[PDB]
Amino acid sequence: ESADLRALAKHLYDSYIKSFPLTKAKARAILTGKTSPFVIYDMNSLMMGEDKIKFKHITPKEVAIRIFQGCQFRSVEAVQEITEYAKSIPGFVNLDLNDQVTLLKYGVHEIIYTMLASLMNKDGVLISEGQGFMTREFLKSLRKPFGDFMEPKFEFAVKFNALELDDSDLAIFIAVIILSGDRPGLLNVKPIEDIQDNLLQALELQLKLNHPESSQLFAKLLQKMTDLRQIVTEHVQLLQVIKKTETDMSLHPLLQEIY
Amino acid sequence: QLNPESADLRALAKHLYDSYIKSFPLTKAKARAILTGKTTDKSPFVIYDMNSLMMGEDKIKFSKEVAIRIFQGCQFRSVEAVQEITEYAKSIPGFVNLDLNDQVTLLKYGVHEIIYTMLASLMNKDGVLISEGQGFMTREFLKSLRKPFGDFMEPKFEFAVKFNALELDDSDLAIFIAVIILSGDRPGLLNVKPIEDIQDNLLQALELQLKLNHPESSQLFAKLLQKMTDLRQIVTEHVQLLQVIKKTETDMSLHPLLQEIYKDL
Numbered sequence: 001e002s003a004d005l006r007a008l009a010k011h012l013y014d015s016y017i018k019s020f021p022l023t024k025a026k027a028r029a030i031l032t033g034k035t036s037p038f039v040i041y042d043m044n045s046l047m048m049g050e051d052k053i054k055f056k057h058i059t060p061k062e063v064a065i066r067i068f069q070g071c072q073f074r075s076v077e078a079v080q081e082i083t084e085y086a087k088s089i090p091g092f093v094n095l096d097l098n099d100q101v102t103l104l105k106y107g108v109h110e111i112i113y114t115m116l117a118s119l120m121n122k123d124g125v126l127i128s129e130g131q132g133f134m135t136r137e138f139l140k141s142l143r144k145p146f147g148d149f150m151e152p153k154f155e156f157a158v159k160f161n162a163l164e165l166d167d168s169d170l171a172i173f174i175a176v177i178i179l180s181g182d183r184p185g186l187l188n189v190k191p192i193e194d195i196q197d198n199l200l201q202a203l204e205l206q207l208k209l210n211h212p213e214s215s216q217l218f219a220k221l222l223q224k225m226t227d228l229r230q231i232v233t234e235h236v237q238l239l240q241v242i243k244k245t246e247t248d249m250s251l252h253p254l255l256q257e258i259y
Numbered sequence: 260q261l262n263p264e265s266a267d268l269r270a271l272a273k274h275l276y277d278s279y280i281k282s283f284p285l286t287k288a289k290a291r292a293i294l295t296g297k298t299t300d301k302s303p304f305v306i307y308d309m310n311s312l313m314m315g316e317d318k319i320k321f322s323k324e325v326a327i328r329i330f331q332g333c334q335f336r337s338v339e340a341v342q343e344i345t346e347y348a349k350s351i352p353g354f355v356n357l358d359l360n361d362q363v364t365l366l367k368y369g370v371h372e373i374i375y376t377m378l379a380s381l382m383n384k385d386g387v388l389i390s391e392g393q394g395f396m397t398r399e400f401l402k403s404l405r406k407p408f409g410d411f412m413e414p415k416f417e418f419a420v421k422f423n424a425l426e427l428d429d430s431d432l433a434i435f436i437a438v439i440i441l442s443g444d445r446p447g448l449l450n451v452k453p454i455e456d457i458q459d460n461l462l463q464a465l466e467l468q469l470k471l472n473h474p475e476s477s478q479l480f481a482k483l484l485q486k487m488t489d490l491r492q493i494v495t496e497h498v499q500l501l502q503v504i505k506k507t508e509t510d511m512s513l514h515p516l517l518q519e520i521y522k523d524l
């Protein structure tokens with residue numbers, strides 16, 4: 001029965017490679033130098049960044065605000081990649097359509113930040129297909145409340161990254177996050193937990209075969225789930241604060257609809 | 260079931276379960292026995308309203324304001340729970356050998372998550388055993404308490420009903436709360452290495468324990484670990500729900516120990 005576990009792993013991996021253009025293996029090569037990305041470390045470099053390379057996340061205003069909005073544009077984009085990926089998880093599409101919607105609704109944020117760590121090191125984050133590298137300090141230098149917008153993700157990133165997981169490990173971890181039976185509103189919890197259970201086994205073997213020397217990596221990874229939700233909860237808090245305050249956030253009526 | 264390594268992990272499970280029974284007067288096995296009302300001597304007095312509360316003062320061993328009285332009651336029992344857990348902690352191989360500051364940090368962030376883990380052993384969907392099992396206060400009575408007290412316990416009942424679904428027994432919990440205490444990612448830890456080394460070992464013990472005790476319960480280990488996020492959540496809500504209390508109830512004192520644990524949490 002350990003055959004069906006390997007098949008599911010490879011399947012998730014293959015699908016993950018197809019759904020996500022910028023993998024961790026690739027991002028890592030770019031980040032460590034052993035491949036170069038345009039570097040954004042201040043206003044002028046940001047400015048030139050937009051002119052030189054056409055960062056779609058920066059279209060036609062305070063910089064802190066356009067950077068924040070760019071983050072949302074990219075997030076929206078990411079949500080589609082994740083949604084497509086989810087469909088390849090054996091059993092997902094056979095679930096009640098409302099539950100599928102529910103799972104993605106509460107799961108994409110956790111996945112977003114999980115995958116974002118793949119593009120981050122203690123010094124910055126890769127943006128627009130890795131074409132650029134936005135400095136951690138520059139982001140942390142934005143005026144309140146934008147300055148501490150990304151920092152919480154960086155702190156998580158540093159920790160998550162010390163586990164040294166690779167694309168094949170993440171593919172399965174990602175699927176496990178999606179099949180969470182404790183999401184509010186689910187109408188049929190059983191099949192969801194039964195699939196996650198099949199995914200957890202697959203993940204456990206993967207980690208043991210891929211990291212035989214890393215003791216209890218499975219437990220440690222599952223524990224990171226706590227850090228993820230705290231990151232999402234906290235993110236949701238700041239998001240409303242920016243909405244309750246900030247008067248220069250309004251976008252075209254249709255754009256606001258899109259997000 | 261074979262190798263010397265497994266043997267070492269079973270020895271650890273036994274040591275931890277033994278210390279657990281020695282440190283906690285009311286185990287889950289005892290709590291369940293009282294709750295399933297099977298016996299004729301373990302019968303608890305049920306408080307489900309004012310007149311009952313009124314009569315419980317005479318029945319069970321055990322400020323004139325219903326809501327606050329019950330609240331001061333939980334605080335005292337909570338302070339006492341901190342003492343039992345602190346005593347259990349000392350028995351965890353390696354804990355007393357860590358830097359003293361880290362010992363404090365680990366207890367500071369770990370006692371509440373553990374308090375609520377264990378509190379579930381005393382709960383079922385209708386209420387919670389109190390005063391060493393002599394009494395039983397229903398969920399509805401608690402929920403009918405003046406605001407903002409009327410909903411301080413509800414989220415703990417919700418957690419308990421789900422967590423109890425795992426059907427863990429005391430021997431499993433002893434290792435699980437040990438794992439909770441030895442968390443290397445607690446804010447402010449000085450030496451994270453020695454703590455992780457200890458937790459990894461405890462995690463191996465827990466993993467084997469759950470496999471030998473619940474062979475038919477697939478992935479119980481992972482499911483139990485994911486529960487640690489429900490605990491964090493329960494603690495956070497509580498802390499915030501508490502800050503609201505002291506602002507509307509300037510006349511309600513919070514015990515110093517609890518206040519120190521929550522401070523800069």
Ligand SMILES: CCCOc1ccc(C[C@@H](Cc2ccccc2)C(=O)O)cc1CNC(=O)c1ccc(N2CCCCC2)cc1
Nearest residue numbers: 321328329331332333334336337374387389390396501517
């Ligand atoms: C009946 C529901 C209460 O159950 C909880 C709930 C929470 C906690 C721990 C809390 C305590 C707390 C709450 C608010 C601010 C600081 C501390 C915690 O986690 O700190 C124990 C307990 C355990 N409580 C008891 O055993 C208990 C004991 C006595 C009591 N009574 C008040 C005195 C007269 C008789 C009735 C009520 C309850």
